Ligand binder design. Structure first.
Ligand code: HEM
Ligand code: HEM
Ligand code: H4B
Ligand code: H4B
Ligand code: JM7
Ligand code: JM7
Ligand code: ZN
Lengths: 411, 407
């Protein structure tokens, strides 16, 4: 079968064959679309086909399909699975796998970059202190004094599901949130629950608006342990506006390195439950969502107040007006400090180019429109006008339950 | 089988059961989501009739009554004998209101039960169609205090006798390809404009020429009519702070009236059923004015604002976008033509979703269409999970008539 997608701005029509290689399920059926739903211990028997499918992909990618090296590797993996119930990836296969999980991530707009990914192999790690050291190095390498480089660090894979490595933080670097007795929140409301966990674990909270959380790290299924990332390694950007001199006085800053640490990397049926990865920000993630969501820093009022917009009626578009100024400020600030960031115009345009290249060379590009379209100025970016097809390819990054819900406390 | 939707801003969770009554197909499968794709006999007719009459009779709390069973009997007899059947006025009004209610891409559905239905099933000619349409336009416009309405022409018979309005909306501006290479007016309407000219229209070849109606009665060849100018309410666009905005020469019309869709009620097909509500500001100011393949005005406006257009990261497009949308809303309000902004509209739709969940067990909604094309995440719908599914009665797309019509 062939599936066609049209761009309604350009009339460019693309043809998708890649979706035929898709195995995992979407949530959708012929009777219901769940395209806007946020979230819609293996046997030997299920493992070998997964390994085989993966290794066939790997061996094809290197133009060695059906070679002796290919066949020997299948036999070697087969025998390893039968004898030990699992298997180990060669370094080459790990790097390929991690790049492909990124390539396949349908909610990521930054995928033009997929082939430039520094992979840190942390499969020799044994302890939470070892994890902390690996993560410091990843943060320092990725930060590169503002000239950000994409990286992932891959800790040992799941075995029986009782010895999992986990990073409990949702991102390596995030700000604390503190619920007050009067019901207000100080700092980031998204991180209140994780913050309370850190405090309970013994973190001494400074209790300010932008406190970098400690790492909470679990090795080999043991109880997690707390660590402070050295502050000298946490690059931050104070936010100011090119024309509005009062903007600095809102006291805003953000961190330069977005590093997702709570997802699971699946490669050839193996599960890497601790695999923090980082790239660089698109300006809207900070200036739209982190600053202006009602459930986040929620600064729209204070900003529109200082701009003296008419706030008595929504139809003056004061919220829209303040939103644009905040986003200009974020981009201006990062650029002024030489910290990598991309605007939503540049990012979405590159993604369209990436997407077309992918159709031509690969037979498709799975893409989740709901996530790809930026949360401001949707239709003046080219992605709004682009039909997309969403389906799940492996290797992949997956959600996993938060570890405080599943962890068996050893005490 | 029972499905949950969460709002990620408020943590409110709703349970959808209505989807189990879903009849038509989405385009998606377990392997592939097509959520962002724009367009994804006697034997057939009786189940469809029954299903509809059952829901109608349930809705007036008379399910399984002798009057329910009698009507099912009557319609059955009529199908078996005439191969089709005729809706009672009550069923027609109910079907039309529910087609709107079921419209998953419509953010304005809080209004669904306040719809004026104009029964034009007695219409026989294109002149009759024109009369019906002018009356709809005048009624709905109501000197700027807009009222929702639908006008329903005779249903499909053997399909060689279709009523159709050839226009995509009752009121739209012409588009002209120029020797220059550029496009004058609205590029969305270039082809339909050519069809009008080919059928006889004298185009004034301007930027904002209201198109004529091209009306097809009884499967006949369609005919042209100019809507009396005095019934087409238009709004000049000015900005409350930028005195220069008016020099751009922009206007839009007050009445959004989709005329190219098909209303399906109880298996009956109404191929000509123009309907109208009122505008959400972004439809005009974001899409009609700023789409690259539409009036595409961002460059011009930005120049007037003296913005640095050297680099995308100055957000000059975004700044000008807001201003254009401020001007649209201000101009409609100053002239007292009903308009809703995207904040107020999406807020209402969230309240409507809650009502529908509470009173009906759900609300089919297409997030891709419901979230406004500017400022998405500062409107509450962005944060609201939605389940999309197809209920009947429905509004459906249908092939453009010129691709099908035999002269
Ligand atoms: C290099 C520059 C990159 C840019 C500009 C970028 C951009 C983005 C953005 C804007 C999102 C949505 C974020 C949100 O709304 O929370 C996203 C999601 C995602 N990205 Fe990227 N990204 C980059 C690098 C990477 C890398 C290096 C990886 C992995 C190797 C990756 C994998 C993903 C995944 C798995 C998601 C979905 C996350 C989720 O569902 O929460 N991205 N990306
Ligand atoms: C009363 C005020 C109304 C508002 C504010 C409103 C709002 C909207 C908006 C913003 C859209 C998306 C349009 C687009 O992006 O092109 C839409 C689509 C739609 N509306 Fe409404 N609407 C209203 C009345 C109605 C009425 C009266 C009906 C039927 C009787 C209706 C049925 C539909 C349908 C079927 C669509 C999808 C059309 C398509 O797919 O192109 N709406 N509406
Ligand atoms: C309900 C809805 O799917 C949810 O708010 C999504 C919408 N699109 C998104 N897109 C991105 N990039 N990130 C998000 O967190 C979300 N949230
Ligand atoms: C490809 C994509 O589905 C297309 O651009 C859609 C997106 N959302 C939309 N939403 C509305 N309300 N109207 C539209 O025309 C569109 N276009
Ligand atoms: C880590 C791989 S993807 C890189 C990225 N650009 N986004 C990460 C998500 C960050 C979140 N939206 C925030 O605003 O902090
Ligand atoms: C007619 C029922 S829905 C009413 C509406 N608000 N929009 C209809 C579509 C109009 C189109 N987006 C335009 O910008 O002309
Ligand atoms: Zn779907």
């Amino acid at each position: 079968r062939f599936l066609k997608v049209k761009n309604w701005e350009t009339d460019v029509v693309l043809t998708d064959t890649l979706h035929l290689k898709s195995t995992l399920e979407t949530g959708c059926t012929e009777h219901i679309c769940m395209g806007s739903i946020m979230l819609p211990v293996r046997t030997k028997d299920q493992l070998f086909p997964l390994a085989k499918e993966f290794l066939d992909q790997y061996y094809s990618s290197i133009k060695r399909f059906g070679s002796k090296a290919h066949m020997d590797r299948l036999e070697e993996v087969n025998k390893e699975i039968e004898s030990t119930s699992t298997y180990q990836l060669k370094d080459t296969e790990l790097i390929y796998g991690a790049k492909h999980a990124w390539r396949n991530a349908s909610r990521c707009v930054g995928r033009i970059q997929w082939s430039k990914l520094q992979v840190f192999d942390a499969r020799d790690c044994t302890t939470a202190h070892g994890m902390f050291n690996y993560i410091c190095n990843h943060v320092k390498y990725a930060t590169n004094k503002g000239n950000l480089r994409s990286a992932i660090t891959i800790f040992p894979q799941r075995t029986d599901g009782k010895h999992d490595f986990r990073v409990w933080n949702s991102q390596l670097i995030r700000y604390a949130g503190y619920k007050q007795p009067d019901g207000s929140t100080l700092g980031d409301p998204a991180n209140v629950q994780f913050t309370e966990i850190c405090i309970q674990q013994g973190w001494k909270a400074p209790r300010g608006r932008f406190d970098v959380l400690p790492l909470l790290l679990q090795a080999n299924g043991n109880d997690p342990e707390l660590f402070q990332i050295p502050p000298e390694l946490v690059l931050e950007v104070p936010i100011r506006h090119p024309k509005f001199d009062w903007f600095k006085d809102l006291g805003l800053k953000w961190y330069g390195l977005p590093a997702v640490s709570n997802m699971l990397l699946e490669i050839g049926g193996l599960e890497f439950s601790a695999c923090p990865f980082s790239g660089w920000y698109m300006g809207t993630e900070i200036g739209v969502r982190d600053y202006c969501d009602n459930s986040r820093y929620n600064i729209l009022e204070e900003v529109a107040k200082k701009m003296d917009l008419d706030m008595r009626k929504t139809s003056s578009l004061w919220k829209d007006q303040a939103l644009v100024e905040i986003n200009i400020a974020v981009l201006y600030s990062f650029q002024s400090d030489k910290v990598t960031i991309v605007d939503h115009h540049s990012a979405t345009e590159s993604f369209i180019k990436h997407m077309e290249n992918e159709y031509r060379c690969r037979g498709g590009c799975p893409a989740d429109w709901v996530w790809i379209v930026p949360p401001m100025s949707g239709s003046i970016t080219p992605v709004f006008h682009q039909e997309m097809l969403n389906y799940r390819l492996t290797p992949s990054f997956e959600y996993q339950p938060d570890p405080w819900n599943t962890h068996v406390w050893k005490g």
